Amino acid sequence: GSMDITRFKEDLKAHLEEKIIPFWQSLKDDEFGGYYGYMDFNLNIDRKAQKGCILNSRILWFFSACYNVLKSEKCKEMAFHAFEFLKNKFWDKEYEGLFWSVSHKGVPVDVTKHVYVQAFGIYGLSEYYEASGDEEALHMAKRLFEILETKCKRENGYTEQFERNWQEKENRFLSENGVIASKTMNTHLHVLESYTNLYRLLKLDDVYEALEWIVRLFVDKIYKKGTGHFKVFCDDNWNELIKAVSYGFDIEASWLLDQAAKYLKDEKLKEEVEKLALEVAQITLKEAFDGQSLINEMIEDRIDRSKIWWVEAETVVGFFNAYQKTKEEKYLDAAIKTWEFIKEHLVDRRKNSEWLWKVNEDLEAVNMPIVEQWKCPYHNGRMCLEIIKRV
């Protein structure tokens, strides 16, 4: 540790408590339950917006984790609110598992079952169980895990999209030329993430075996050996549809794999994964860190230098994690500089706001929502919570 690292933690903790937590508390929907689904760039909440399950589970995870780390009783109450809406509106009582989306009143809008949604459900429900002791949350988390393992898993990963009654179908995620990606890194990344949290709290042998299995999948099939990059969108056999690098996915995967590795009982695999995580962090720092912040992606030979909120959040955690493992100050410097970038260019200066979705390559704000089905408190909230836990 150091004076810089201590001040870094204190700055992030203050930011979480004074900016992020009160903002998401203001999205609480006390008329219909859950949290409002949309807030535009002008800070206007669309109270009637459809409510995405992933967003609700991310809010459940966030408030639960805030309670677990900060012991804020208000956060526990906010988590309960998200949990009630999950169990009452997103949980399918007839066929089990979580709907994709509901209306602002909770009427099912999209009842298909996606592994991406189920994974975030496990992640949020397991965190909420730690916060509350609610064995209903535990039961739903275990049931989601059982369904993924017994209905969705295949020899080379998970089939990602199902009908409401769990009959498989083609995926809903597309390449930028419109070809269905039957295997996606971000679906499988969040399975890994949720299984790590579930095993951390339960330590059951079935969960451990599934955690080792998905870690092995990342090492053997998803990682592009020798490149520091993971495949993004693939066919059913983990062949890339396009040569795409997502620097944000890479650096997130780096520290999530390193975290899962701490539970591995296979020493060989553990050493492989810890080595992989570091190789990714090093290549991310070399290729994607511009001295201020991380760029977004490269699709074939076209580089997107936009600064995206979640990319920068995961960069802070991934570089700090690499610093903890290597003690090489270059990673610590990159992590703090990225935070200083976030503070100056992505934290919204307006009252009653939070983080901007992105700024462009010239650091200009782009009209994008502050809250949306894909913009959550989870990436940036977790950035603060991780540093608090690790320092």
Q: How many residues line the site for ligand BMA (CB under 6 A)?
A: 10
| 8 A C-beta contact, residue 163 and residue 113 | yes
Residues in the chain: 391
**Amino acid, res. 240:** E
CB atoms within 10 A of CB 8: 21
Shortest reach from residue 298's CB to ligand BMA, in Å: 15
DSSP for 234-274, written as a single string = E-TTS-BSS-EEEHHHHHHHHHHHHHHHTT-S-HHHHHHHH
User: Should residue 186 be labelled a site residue for ligand BMA when binding is judged by CB under 6 A?
Assistant: yes
* Dihedral (CA of 180, 181, 187, 191) sign: positive
Q: How far apart are CA 125 and CA 163, in angstroms?
A: 22
Report whether 280 contacts 253 (CB < 8 A): yes
Q: Report d(CA 245, CA 248) in Å as an integer.
A: 9
- 271 vs 374, which CB is nearer to ligand BMA? 374
Residue nearest to ligand BMA (CB): 103
Cβ 109 to ligand BMA, closest distance in Å? 4
Q: Which is nearer to ligand BMA, 69 or 368 (CB)?
A: 368
**Among the residue ranges 102-110, 119-127, 158-166, 202-210, the one whose residues contact ligand BMA (CB under 6 A):** 102-110
Identify the sign of the CA torsion 256, 258, 264, 270: positive
Q: How far apart are CA 169 and CA 350, in angstroms?
A: 44
Q: Does 107 bind ligand BMA (CB under 6 A)?
A: yes
In whole angstroms, give the CA distance from residue 270 to residue 266: 6
Q: Which of 45, 69, 109, 219 binds ligand BMA (CB under 6 A)?
A: 109
Sequence positions preceding breaks in the chain, C–N over 2.5 Å: none
Binding mask 36-65 for ligand BMA (x = CB under 6 A): ------xx----------------------
Say whether residue 269 binds ligand BMA (CB under 6 A). Answer: no
Which span (103-111, 233-241, 269-277, 331-339) binds ligand BMA, by CB under 6 A? Answer: 103-111
Using rule CB under 6 A, residue 103 touches ligand BMA: yes
Note whether 349 binds ligand BMA by CB under 6 A. Answer: no
Residue 186 or 259: the one with the smaller Cβ distance to ligand BMA is 186
Residue span binding ligand BMA (CB under 6 A) among the ranges 101-109, 127-135, 206-214, 318-326: 101-109
Q: Which stretches of the chain bind ligand BMA, using CB under 6 A?
A: 42-43, 103, 107, 109, 186, 310, 350, 374, 376
